[PDB]
Design a protein around this ligand. Structure first.
Ligand code: 79R
Ligand code: PHU
Length: 290
């Protein structure tokens, strides 16, 4: 059931492009009559050994996860030849949360944003119990299953912590979404479940601004970086964060949610709340808003 025959996967279109991979909308059509199920299928391009190995990892992690708040693994496929591997996932046609929020802002109220917040937190709690660091977490990689149900996706950078270590360190990445990363990740290449909490804070910011491009993290940075313009962004961001500067409270954001953001952005990773501590608070806020 989890082995899709490659010759029966029919390409329709591209859903996402990464540095080394893409996610493609396909039909699995073993009857050949175009009646099969639609699936989302990841494969690599421009991939060396490291990228192949990371993709094997991604598959094993996602296959093991069973949460209502994590995109469903379906199976794998292999073509003929070297570098044949494909990851088959459920397809969610409503697309990503980032696009969904911008399209439907005028009808998605604070209660609904609280619901999405709580669901994403529950998915991160699930990951944490499996010692998985997601790293990529952002509104652009969270999927909308229905208007009242979201799921975490893009496990391309996900990694399991060793049983006896609560962080990992990588070599300097070439291309990072710098405005989502914890300072220890930006400066020392350290990632953990605590750096995931920082990113979740930025997700809460994305939710409560409806991903408006006028107040995106990059826009706020360009406003707050100061009058000196030709300064490298990463350098300057690290200085602003060290000085204690943070993204502003969105006008429509409940004060209690802004306070949770601030705690997610504590300087010291050990001072940030766990997802297990955040969950109850978001659950109480959501349930009080129904
Ligand atoms: C979000 C996930 C994970 C990242 C790659 C795209 C992917 N993805 C998407 C999808 C298409 C576009 C976007 C989001 C973007 C934003 N912002 C974007 O890429 N832009 C604007 C260029 O996300 N739709 C998917 C339906 N089913 C899927 N199943 C597994 C995965 C999956 C689907
Ligand atoms: N976490 C946080 O506040 N990050 C940030 C701060 C200033 C500009 C852009 C991003």
């Amino acid at each position: 059931p989890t082995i899709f025959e490659e010759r029966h996967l029919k390409y329709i279109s591209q859903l996402g492009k990464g540095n080394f991979g893409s996610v493609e909308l396909c039909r699995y059509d073993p009857l050949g009559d175009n009646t099969g199920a639609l699936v989302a299928v990841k494969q690599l391009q421009h991939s060396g050994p490291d990228q192949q190995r990371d993709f094997q990892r991604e598959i094993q992690i996602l296959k093991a996860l069973h949460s209502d708040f994590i995109v469903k693994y379906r199976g794998v496929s292999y073509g003929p030849g070297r570098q044949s591997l494909r990851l088959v996932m459920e397809y969610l046609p409503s697309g990503c949360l980032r696009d969904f929020l911008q399209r439907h802002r005028a009808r998605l109220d604070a209660s609904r944003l609280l619901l999405y917040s709580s669901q994403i937190c529950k998915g991160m709690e699930y990951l944490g119990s499996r010692r998985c660091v997601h790293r990529a977490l952002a509104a652009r990689n969270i999927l909308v299953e229905s208007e009242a149900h979201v799921k975490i996706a893009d496990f391309g950078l996900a990694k399991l912590l060793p049983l006896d270590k609560d962080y990992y360190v990588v070599r300097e990445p070439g291309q990072s979404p710098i405005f989502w990363y914890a300072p220890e990740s930006l400066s020392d290449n350290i990632f953990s479940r605590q750096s995931d909490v920082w990113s979740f804070g930025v997700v809460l910011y994305e939710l409560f601004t409806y991903c408006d491009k006028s107040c995106s993290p990059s826009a706020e940075f360009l406003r707050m970086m100061g009058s000196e313009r030709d300064v490298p962004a990463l350098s300057r961001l690290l200085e602003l964060l060290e000085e204690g500067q943070r993204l502003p409270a969105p006008p429509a954001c409940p004060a209690e949610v802004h306070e949770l953001m601030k705690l997610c952005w504590a300087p010291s990773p050990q001072d940030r709340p766990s997802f297990s501590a955040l969950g109850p608070q978001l659950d109480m806020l959501w349930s009080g808003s129904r």
